Design a protein around this ligand. Structure first.
Ligand SMILES: CCC(=O)N(c1ccccc1)C1(C(=O)OC)CCN(CCc2ccccc2)CC1
Lengths: 215, 209
Protein backbone atom coordinates (compact mmCIF):
# COMPACT_ATOMS: atom_id res chain seq x y z
CA UNK A 1 0.00 0.00 0.00
CA UNK A 2 1.01 3.65 -0.46
CA UNK A 3 2.27 5.42 2.67
CA UNK A 4 2.79 9.16 3.17
CA UNK A 5 5.18 10.76 5.65
CA UNK A 6 5.72 14.46 6.33
CA UNK A 7 9.09 15.89 7.29
CA UNK A 8 10.57 19.34 7.78
CA UNK A 9 11.30 21.92 10.47
CA UNK A 10 8.83 22.03 13.35
CA UNK A 11 9.66 25.62 14.32
CA UNK A 12 9.37 28.73 12.11
CA UNK A 13 10.13 32.34 12.91
CA UNK A 14 7.40 34.94 12.33
CA UNK A 15 7.38 36.16 8.71
CA UNK A 16 9.60 33.18 7.82
CA UNK A 17 8.72 30.34 5.46
CA UNK A 18 7.25 27.03 6.52
CA UNK A 19 8.66 24.16 4.45
CA UNK A 20 7.46 20.56 4.56
CA UNK A 21 8.02 17.54 2.36
CA UNK A 22 5.79 14.51 1.85
CA UNK A 23 7.66 11.33 0.98
CA UNK A 24 5.46 8.89 -0.93
CA UNK A 25 6.42 5.22 -0.57
CA UNK A 26 4.86 2.11 -2.06
CA UNK A 27 3.54 3.83 -5.19
CA UNK A 28 4.32 6.53 -7.71
CA UNK A 29 3.62 10.26 -7.59
CA UNK A 30 2.53 9.76 -11.21
CA UNK A 31 -1.05 8.53 -11.02
CA UNK A 32 -4.63 9.68 -11.43
CA UNK A 33 -4.69 10.95 -7.84
CA UNK A 34 -4.04 14.48 -6.71
CA UNK A 35 -1.75 15.26 -3.79
CA UNK A 36 -2.70 17.76 -1.13
CA UNK A 37 -1.87 19.48 2.13
CA UNK A 38 -4.43 19.90 4.94
CA UNK A 39 -3.84 21.58 8.28
CA UNK A 40 -5.50 21.61 11.68
CA UNK A 41 -4.68 24.17 14.37
CA UNK A 42 -4.68 22.61 17.85
CA UNK A 43 -8.27 22.05 18.92
CA UNK A 44 -9.73 23.34 15.65
CA UNK A 45 -11.14 21.92 12.44
CA UNK A 46 -9.54 20.86 9.18
CA UNK A 47 -8.50 23.44 6.58
CA UNK A 48 -7.38 22.47 3.09
CA UNK A 49 -4.31 24.28 1.81
CA UNK A 50 -4.07 23.11 -1.80
CA UNK A 51 -3.49 20.28 -4.25
CA UNK A 52 -1.04 19.38 -7.00
CA UNK A 53 -1.17 16.96 -9.94
CA UNK A 54 1.88 14.94 -10.90
CA UNK A 55 2.44 17.18 -13.96
CA UNK A 56 2.81 20.18 -11.63
CA UNK A 57 -0.62 21.79 -12.04
CA UNK A 58 -1.61 23.41 -8.75
CA UNK A 59 -4.75 24.72 -7.11
CA UNK A 60 -4.77 26.53 -3.76
CA UNK A 61 -7.14 27.72 -1.08
CA UNK A 62 -7.93 31.31 -2.18
CA UNK A 63 -7.60 32.59 1.40
CA UNK A 64 -3.94 31.43 1.40
CA UNK A 65 -3.20 31.51 -2.31
CA UNK A 66 -0.59 34.29 -2.30
CA UNK A 67 1.59 32.55 0.32
CA UNK A 68 1.39 28.90 -0.85
CA UNK A 69 3.76 26.93 -3.07
CA UNK A 70 3.13 23.23 -3.70
CA UNK A 71 5.66 21.37 -5.84
CA UNK A 72 6.26 17.80 -7.02
CA UNK A 73 9.58 16.02 -7.53
CA UNK A 74 9.13 12.68 -9.28
CA UNK A 75 12.82 11.79 -9.07
CA UNK A 76 12.50 11.67 -5.28
CA UNK A 77 8.80 10.59 -5.35
CA UNK A 78 7.84 13.48 -3.08
CA UNK A 79 5.71 16.61 -3.03
CA UNK A 80 6.29 19.67 -0.86
CA UNK A 81 4.63 22.70 0.71
CA UNK A 82 6.06 26.17 1.27
CA UNK A 83 4.01 28.73 3.19
CA UNK A 84 5.53 32.20 3.26
CA UNK A 85 5.11 35.18 5.63
CA UNK A 86 3.84 32.96 8.45
CA UNK A 87 2.05 34.28 11.57
CA UNK A 88 0.70 32.63 14.72
CA UNK A 89 -2.40 31.70 12.72
CA UNK A 90 -0.23 29.19 10.83
CA UNK A 91 0.67 27.09 13.89
CA UNK A 92 -1.02 23.76 13.22
CA UNK A 93 -0.60 20.10 12.51
CA UNK A 94 0.07 19.72 8.78
CA UNK A 95 -1.02 16.57 6.96
CA UNK A 96 -0.12 15.42 3.48
CA UNK A 97 -2.96 13.56 1.82
CA UNK A 98 -3.93 11.76 -1.33
CA UNK A 99 -7.10 12.84 -3.14
CA UNK A 100 -9.35 10.73 -5.32
CA UNK A 101 -10.77 13.08 -7.94
CA UNK A 102 -13.55 12.26 -10.35
CA UNK A 103 -15.28 14.42 -12.95
CA UNK A 104 -17.65 15.99 -10.38
CA UNK A 105 -16.50 14.96 -6.88
CA UNK A 106 -13.41 14.35 -4.79
CA UNK A 107 -12.36 13.07 -1.40
CA UNK A 108 -9.30 12.14 0.67
CA UNK A 109 -8.35 8.46 0.75
CA UNK A 110 -4.91 8.45 2.45
CA UNK A 111 -3.21 10.67 5.05
CA UNK A 112 0.23 11.08 6.50
CA UNK A 113 0.64 10.99 10.26
CA UNK A 114 0.70 14.78 10.56
CA UNK A 115 3.51 17.03 11.80
CA UNK A 116 3.13 19.98 14.17
CA UNK A 117 4.68 23.25 12.97
CA UNK A 118 4.80 26.09 15.49
CA UNK A 119 5.47 29.73 14.62
CA UNK A 120 7.60 30.85 17.57
CA UNK A 121 7.78 34.51 18.50
CA UNK A 122 8.05 35.00 22.27
CA UNK A 123 9.47 32.01 24.12
CA UNK A 124 10.48 31.08 27.65
CA UNK A 125 12.49 27.98 28.64
CA UNK A 126 11.09 25.94 31.54
CA UNK A 127 12.81 24.97 34.71
CA UNK A 128 12.80 21.18 35.14
CA UNK A 129 12.55 19.94 38.71
CA UNK A 130 12.60 16.34 39.96
CA UNK A 131 9.61 15.21 42.01
CA UNK A 132 11.28 12.74 44.34
CA UNK A 133 9.34 9.67 45.62
CA UNK A 134 7.77 1.14 52.46
CA UNK A 135 6.17 -1.43 50.16
CA UNK A 136 3.47 -1.00 47.55
CA UNK A 137 3.94 1.43 44.67
CA UNK A 138 5.67 4.79 44.68
CA UNK A 139 5.12 7.89 42.55
CA UNK A 140 7.94 10.03 41.24
CA UNK A 141 7.98 12.57 38.52
CA UNK A 142 9.24 15.67 36.88
CA UNK A 143 7.83 19.19 37.00
CA UNK A 144 8.29 21.29 33.87
CA UNK A 145 7.72 24.82 35.14
CA UNK A 146 6.91 28.05 33.31
CA UNK A 147 7.41 27.54 29.59
CA UNK A 148 6.01 29.15 26.46
CA UNK A 149 4.77 28.27 23.90
CA UNK A 150 3.47 24.73 23.89
CA UNK A 151 4.41 21.97 23.51
CA UNK A 152 6.81 20.04 25.71
CA UNK A 153 7.51 16.34 25.30
CA UNK A 154 8.37 14.12 28.25
CA UNK A 155 9.67 10.57 28.14
CA UNK A 156 11.28 8.35 30.76
CA UNK A 157 14.56 6.45 30.57
CA UNK A 158 14.85 7.44 26.91
CA UNK A 159 11.51 5.83 26.10
CA UNK A 160 12.40 2.45 27.62
CA UNK A 161 9.99 3.12 30.50
CA UNK A 162 6.39 3.39 29.32
CA UNK A 163 4.32 1.36 31.79
CA UNK A 164 2.92 3.53 34.56
CA UNK A 165 3.80 6.83 32.87
CA UNK A 166 1.24 9.62 33.09
CA UNK A 167 2.14 13.01 31.64
CA UNK A 168 -0.59 15.41 32.70
CA UNK A 169 -2.17 18.10 30.52
CA UNK A 170 -0.37 21.40 30.96
CA UNK A 171 -1.85 24.19 33.07
CA UNK A 172 -2.07 27.70 31.60
CA UNK A 173 -1.23 29.89 34.57
CA UNK A 174 -2.44 33.42 35.24
CA UNK A 175 1.07 34.46 34.19
CA UNK A 176 0.31 33.28 30.66
CA UNK A 177 2.99 30.57 31.01
CA UNK A 178 2.52 26.79 30.92
CA UNK A 179 3.51 24.17 33.46
CA UNK A 180 3.10 20.43 33.40
CA UNK A 181 4.04 17.39 35.40
CA UNK A 182 4.80 13.84 34.38
CA UNK A 183 4.62 11.03 36.91
CA UNK A 184 5.70 7.39 36.87
CA UNK A 185 4.17 4.82 39.21
CA UNK A 186 6.83 2.21 39.98
CA UNK A 187 7.24 -0.59 42.52
CA UNK A 188 8.72 0.81 45.72
CA UNK A 189 11.18 -2.12 45.66
CA UNK A 190 12.92 -0.84 42.50
CA UNK A 191 13.77 2.59 43.94
CA UNK A 192 17.17 1.95 45.51
CA UNK A 193 18.21 -0.09 42.46
CA UNK A 194 16.68 1.39 39.27
CA UNK A 195 17.66 4.78 37.87
CA UNK A 196 14.82 7.02 36.66
CA UNK A 197 15.54 9.89 34.26
CA UNK A 198 12.90 12.15 32.75
CA UNK A 199 13.73 13.34 29.23
CA UNK A 200 12.17 16.79 28.75
CA UNK A 201 12.30 18.62 25.41
CA UNK A 202 10.89 22.10 24.86
CA UNK A 203 12.02 22.62 21.28
CA UNK A 204 10.84 26.27 20.97
CA UNK A 205 13.46 27.36 23.55
CA UNK A 206 15.88 24.48 22.86
CA UNK A 207 15.56 23.28 26.44
CA UNK A 208 16.54 19.60 26.27
CA UNK A 209 17.14 18.14 29.72
CA UNK A 210 17.54 14.61 31.06
CA UNK A 211 16.79 14.98 34.76
CA UNK A 212 17.71 12.24 37.22
CA UNK A 213 15.01 11.68 39.84
CA UNK A 214 16.48 10.30 43.07
CA UNK A 215 15.04 9.83 46.60
CA UNK B 1 -20.66 26.21 3.40
CA UNK B 2 -21.07 22.89 5.28
CA UNK B 3 -22.97 22.84 8.59
CA UNK B 4 -22.74 20.18 11.26
CA UNK B 5 -23.57 20.37 14.97
CA UNK B 6 -20.55 20.93 17.23
CA UNK B 7 -21.49 18.10 19.61
CA UNK B 8 -23.61 14.95 19.95
CA UNK B 9 -23.90 12.75 23.03
CA UNK B 10 -25.27 9.21 23.34
CA UNK B 11 -25.37 6.35 25.80
CA UNK B 12 -23.54 3.07 25.14
CA UNK B 13 -25.53 0.84 22.82
CA UNK B 14 -27.72 3.69 21.53
CA UNK B 15 -27.71 5.08 17.99
CA UNK B 16 -25.94 8.34 17.17
CA UNK B 17 -27.08 10.52 14.25
CA UNK B 18 -24.72 13.20 12.93
CA UNK B 19 -26.10 15.48 10.24
CA UNK B 20 -24.32 17.65 7.68
CA UNK B 21 -26.13 20.32 5.66
CA UNK B 22 -25.03 22.10 2.52
CA UNK B 23 -26.40 23.12 -0.85
CA UNK B 24 -23.53 21.33 -2.67
CA UNK B 25 -24.24 17.87 -1.22
CA UNK B 26 -26.58 16.70 -4.00
CA UNK B 27 -24.13 17.33 -6.83
CA UNK B 28 -20.76 17.02 -4.99
CA UNK B 29 -21.71 14.30 -2.47
CA UNK B 30 -20.69 13.90 1.16
CA UNK B 31 -17.82 12.03 2.74
CA UNK B 32 -17.42 11.29 6.45
CA UNK B 33 -14.17 11.08 8.41
CA UNK B 34 -13.51 9.95 11.96
CA UNK B 35 -10.63 11.58 13.84
CA UNK B 36 -9.30 10.46 17.19
CA UNK B 37 -6.76 12.42 19.26
CA UNK B 38 -3.24 12.57 17.77
CA UNK B 39 -4.38 10.68 14.64
CA UNK B 40 -5.08 11.60 11.04
CA UNK B 41 -8.70 11.49 9.84
CA UNK B 42 -10.07 8.12 8.69
CA UNK B 43 -12.71 7.81 5.97
CA UNK B 44 -15.72 5.97 7.40
CA UNK B 45 -18.39 6.67 4.74
CA UNK B 46 -17.56 7.16 1.05
CA UNK B 47 -19.89 9.03 -1.32
CA UNK B 48 -22.90 9.43 0.98
CA UNK B 49 -23.64 5.77 1.63
CA UNK B 50 -20.68 3.49 0.88
CA UNK B 51 -18.85 1.85 3.79
CA UNK B 52 -15.19 1.10 3.13
CA UNK B 53 -14.04 -2.44 3.84
CA UNK B 54 -12.51 -2.48 7.27
CA UNK B 55 -15.03 -0.03 8.74
CA UNK B 56 -17.35 -1.71 11.28
CA UNK B 57 -20.81 -2.52 9.96
CA UNK B 58 -22.39 -0.26 12.62
CA UNK B 59 -21.36 2.79 10.56
CA UNK B 60 -23.85 3.78 7.87
CA UNK B 61 -24.68 6.85 5.84
CA UNK B 62 -27.78 8.28 4.24
CA UNK B 63 -28.56 11.18 1.96
CA UNK B 64 -31.48 13.63 2.02
CA UNK B 65 -30.81 16.24 -0.65
CA UNK B 66 -29.18 19.26 1.06
CA UNK B 67 -28.47 17.03 4.11
CA UNK B 68 -26.41 13.84 4.62
CA UNK B 69 -26.31 11.83 7.84
CA UNK B 70 -23.81 9.54 9.53
CA UNK B 71 -25.46 6.91 11.72
CA UNK B 72 -23.55 4.80 14.25
CA UNK B 73 -25.60 1.98 15.73
CA UNK B 74 -24.77 0.29 19.01
CA UNK B 75 -22.34 3.06 19.86
CA UNK B 76 -19.27 1.93 21.78
CA UNK B 77 -16.83 3.90 23.90
CA UNK B 78 -14.24 3.46 21.14
CA UNK B 79 -16.46 5.51 18.77
CA UNK B 80 -15.83 8.67 20.81
CA UNK B 81 -14.12 10.94 18.29
CA UNK B 82 -14.53 14.00 16.10
CA UNK B 83 -16.50 13.44 12.89
CA UNK B 84 -16.05 15.67 9.83
CA UNK B 85 -18.23 15.84 6.77
CA UNK B 86 -16.61 16.92 3.50
CA UNK B 87 -17.92 17.98 0.10
CA UNK B 88 -16.84 20.43 -2.60
CA UNK B 89 -17.88 23.89 -3.62
CA UNK B 90 -20.45 24.55 -6.31
CA UNK B 91 -17.79 25.18 -8.98
CA UNK B 92 -15.92 21.94 -8.09
CA UNK B 93 -12.79 23.96 -7.48
CA UNK B 94 -12.19 23.45 -3.75
CA UNK B 95 -13.08 20.91 -1.06
CA UNK B 96 -15.37 21.98 1.76
CA UNK B 97 -15.25 20.75 5.34
CA UNK B 98 -17.78 20.92 8.12
CA UNK B 99 -16.65 22.25 11.47
CA UNK B 100 -16.60 18.79 12.98
CA UNK B 101 -18.91 17.09 15.46
CA UNK B 102 -17.53 15.81 18.76
CA UNK B 103 -19.29 12.55 19.65
CA UNK B 104 -19.34 11.96 23.40
CA UNK B 105 -20.30 8.56 24.83
CA UNK B 106 -21.91 8.82 28.27
CA UNK B 107 -22.71 6.14 30.84
CA UNK B 108 -19.17 5.47 32.04
CA UNK B 109 -19.06 4.01 35.58
CA UNK B 110 -18.33 6.29 38.50
CA UNK B 111 -14.68 6.29 39.57
CA UNK B 112 -13.02 7.96 42.59
CA UNK B 113 -9.83 10.00 42.09
CA UNK B 114 -6.36 8.95 43.11
CA UNK B 115 -4.27 11.83 44.49
CA UNK B 116 -0.51 12.33 44.62
CA UNK B 117 0.94 15.41 46.31
CA UNK B 118 4.54 16.48 45.87
CA UNK B 119 6.45 19.00 47.98
CA UNK B 120 8.88 21.56 46.56
CA UNK B 121 12.09 20.14 45.15
CA UNK B 122 15.40 21.11 46.72
CA UNK B 123 16.45 22.51 43.34
CA UNK B 124 13.44 24.82 43.29
CA UNK B 125 13.95 26.02 46.86
CA UNK B 126 17.54 26.92 45.92
CA UNK B 127 16.01 29.09 43.18
CA UNK B 128 14.06 30.84 45.96
CA UNK B 129 10.75 29.42 44.75
CA UNK B 130 8.33 26.78 45.98
CA UNK B 131 5.61 24.89 44.12
CA UNK B 132 3.39 22.16 45.55
CA UNK B 133 1.98 19.79 42.91
CA UNK B 134 -1.32 17.95 43.41
CA UNK B 135 -2.04 15.34 40.72
CA UNK B 136 -5.52 13.82 40.44
CA UNK B 137 -6.18 10.88 38.13
CA UNK B 138 -8.62 8.15 37.17
CA UNK B 139 -11.89 9.80 38.19
CA UNK B 140 -15.38 10.00 36.66
CA UNK B 141 -17.47 12.11 36.15
CA UNK B 142 -15.00 14.80 35.12
CA UNK B 143 -15.73 17.35 37.83
CA UNK B 144 -13.62 17.85 40.95
CA UNK B 145 -12.88 20.60 43.45
CA UNK B 146 -9.47 21.20 45.00
CA UNK B 147 -8.92 22.91 48.36
CA UNK B 148 -5.49 23.75 49.76
CA UNK B 149 -4.71 24.13 53.46
CA UNK B 150 -1.67 25.57 55.24
CA UNK B 151 -1.62 23.56 58.46
CA UNK B 152 -5.46 23.62 58.77
CA UNK B 153 -6.17 27.09 57.32
CA UNK B 154 -7.59 27.52 53.79
CA UNK B 155 -5.23 28.91 51.14
CA UNK B 156 -6.84 30.57 48.13
CA UNK B 157 -4.06 32.71 46.65
CA UNK B 158 -1.42 31.25 44.36
CA UNK B 159 -3.57 28.29 43.28
CA UNK B 160 -3.66 27.17 39.63
CA UNK B 161 -5.93 24.26 38.73
CA UNK B 162 -6.54 22.67 35.35
CA UNK B 163 -9.88 21.81 33.84
CA UNK B 164 -10.31 18.02 34.02
CA UNK B 165 -9.33 16.29 30.78
CA UNK B 166 -10.04 12.78 29.54
CA UNK B 167 -7.22 10.21 29.69
CA UNK B 168 -6.56 7.40 27.19
CA UNK B 169 -8.57 5.03 29.44
CA UNK B 170 -11.69 7.27 29.34
CA UNK B 171 -11.28 8.49 32.93
CA UNK B 172 -10.40 12.09 33.77
CA UNK B 173 -7.20 13.74 35.01
CA UNK B 174 -6.52 17.12 36.60
CA UNK B 175 -3.76 18.92 38.41
CA UNK B 176 -3.43 21.80 40.84
CA UNK B 177 -0.36 23.86 41.64
CA UNK B 178 0.20 25.95 44.76
CA UNK B 179 2.94 28.58 44.60
CA UNK B 180 4.56 29.61 47.89
CA UNK B 181 7.60 31.47 49.00
CA UNK B 182 10.29 29.28 50.58
CA UNK B 183 9.63 31.17 53.82
CA UNK B 184 5.93 30.27 53.74
CA UNK B 185 6.80 26.66 53.00
CA UNK B 186 9.24 26.38 55.93
CA UNK B 187 7.08 28.40 58.39
CA UNK B 188 4.11 26.00 58.52
CA UNK B 189 3.98 22.47 59.87
CA UNK B 190 2.44 21.07 56.68
CA UNK B 191 0.34 21.77 53.60
CA UNK B 192 -2.55 19.69 52.33
CA UNK B 193 -4.42 19.16 49.06
CA UNK B 194 -8.09 18.21 49.58
CA UNK B 195 -9.78 16.74 46.50
CA UNK B 196 -13.58 16.49 46.51
CA UNK B 197 -15.45 14.35 43.99
CA UNK B 198 -19.17 13.51 44.14
CA UNK B 199 -19.31 14.53 47.80
CA UNK B 200 -16.33 12.36 48.82
CA UNK B 201 -12.93 13.77 49.79
CA UNK B 202 -9.33 12.56 49.58
CA UNK B 203 -6.58 14.51 51.35
CA UNK B 204 -2.79 14.36 51.01
CA UNK B 205 -0.30 16.19 53.22
CA UNK B 206 3.36 17.13 52.82
CA UNK B 207 5.82 18.78 55.18
CA UNK B 208 9.29 20.37 54.97
CA UNK B 209 12.18 17.91 55.09
C1 LIG C 1 -6.65 20.07 -14.74
C2 LIG C 1 -7.60 21.06 -13.99
C3 LIG C 1 -8.37 20.34 -12.88
O1 LIG C 1 -8.61 19.19 -13.02
N1 LIG C 1 -8.79 21.09 -11.66
C4 LIG C 1 -8.45 22.52 -11.53
C5 LIG C 1 -9.43 23.48 -11.70
C6 LIG C 1 -9.11 24.82 -11.57
C7 LIG C 1 -7.81 25.20 -11.29
C8 LIG C 1 -6.84 24.24 -11.13
C9 LIG C 1 -7.16 22.89 -11.25
C10 LIG C 1 -9.55 20.41 -10.58
C11 LIG C 1 -10.66 19.69 -11.29
O2 LIG C 1 -11.29 20.30 -12.09
O3 LIG C 1 -10.93 18.34 -11.01
C12 LIG C 1 -10.54 17.45 -12.02
C13 LIG C 1 -10.24 21.33 -9.52
C14 LIG C 1 -10.70 20.47 -8.27
N2 LIG C 1 -9.78 19.72 -7.68
C15 LIG C 1 -10.43 18.92 -6.76
C16 LIG C 1 -10.86 19.69 -5.49
C17 LIG C 1 -11.23 18.73 -4.32
C18 LIG C 1 -10.23 18.10 -3.57
C19 LIG C 1 -10.58 17.26 -2.53
C20 LIG C 1 -11.93 17.02 -2.24
C21 LIG C 1 -12.90 17.65 -2.98
C22 LIG C 1 -12.56 18.50 -4.02
C23 LIG C 1 -9.21 18.89 -8.51
C24 LIG C 1 -8.64 19.47 -9.80
Amino acid sequence: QVQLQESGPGLVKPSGTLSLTCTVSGGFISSRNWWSWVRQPPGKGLEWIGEVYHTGITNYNPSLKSRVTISVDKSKNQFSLKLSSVTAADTAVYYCAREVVGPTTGYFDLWGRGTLVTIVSRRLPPSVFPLAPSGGTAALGCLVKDYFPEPVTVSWNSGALTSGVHTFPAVLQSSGLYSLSSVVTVPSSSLGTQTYICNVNHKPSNTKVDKKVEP
Amino acid sequence: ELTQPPSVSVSPGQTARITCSGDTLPKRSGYWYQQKPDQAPLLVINKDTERPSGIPERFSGSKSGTTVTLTISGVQAEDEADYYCQSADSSFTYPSFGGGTKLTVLGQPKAAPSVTLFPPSSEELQANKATLVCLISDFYPGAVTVAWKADSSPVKAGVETTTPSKQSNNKYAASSYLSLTPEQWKSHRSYSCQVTHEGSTVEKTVAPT
